[PDB]
């Protein structure tokens with residue numbers, strides 16, 4: 001089930017032919033209005049870009065522009081799926097060569113910070129063996145006013161990630177942590193994109209980057 005301005009069923013046969021013709025498959029979890037996923041599709045035509053988000057109405061503006069003709073900015077290799085990651089359909093299982101969570105909010109953000117099974121399993125479910133997971137979080141959300149979904153949780157830092165046992169929880173659910181770091185002055189354009197913000201603005205923010213590799217699950221501490 002996905003979008004073409006309207007909300008329709010996707011032909012399973014069209015799904016296999018698209019994946020097979022793709023040089024690479026990239027799944028973005030939590031795309032907002034999916035301008036980020038759209039820019040990537042344009043920048044890489046040979047990639048099959050898959051944006052997944054429960055708020056499907058939020059990504060209709062992108063769905064319209066991507067539905068246009070190549071001469072007017074159409075992106076045929078863009079697939080915007082209406083779904084939550086904890087209940088991702090079986091058609092998206094193990095199809096991604098790369099999974100990215102960029103500037104998450106709500107259930108996805110809280111699930112990542114806490115290391116909840118439902119979210120982490122869903123993220124792992126869509127990835128192929130060896131696929132990289134890229135989580136990027138702006139650290140300004142731990143400055144008042146702090147969003148409701150995280151205002152009862154201490155700030156997530158490179159040190160906190162291992163102390164709270166997030167490293168071992170990720171590894172147990174199939175994500176082997178490769179790198180955790182803060183990258184200050186990260187240009188917000190390179191991770192975040194909505195049709196409300198113009199490019200080349202120059203807005204920066206300290207970003208918590210978390211990189212992992214899809215491995216076999218059930219791998220806990222002793």
Ligand SMILES: Nc1ncnc2c1ncn2[C@@H]1O[C@H](CSCC[C@H](N)C(=O)O)[C@@H](O)[C@H]1O
Nearest residue numbers: 030031032085102103105106107108192193
């Ligand atoms: N459990 C969940 N699974 C998948 N997506 C979720 C989710 N909980 C929240 N989201 C989505 O994640 C989105 C974050 S807004 C971020 C948009 C984009 N990454 C950008 O930087 O521009 C929200 O629109 C919300 O709909």
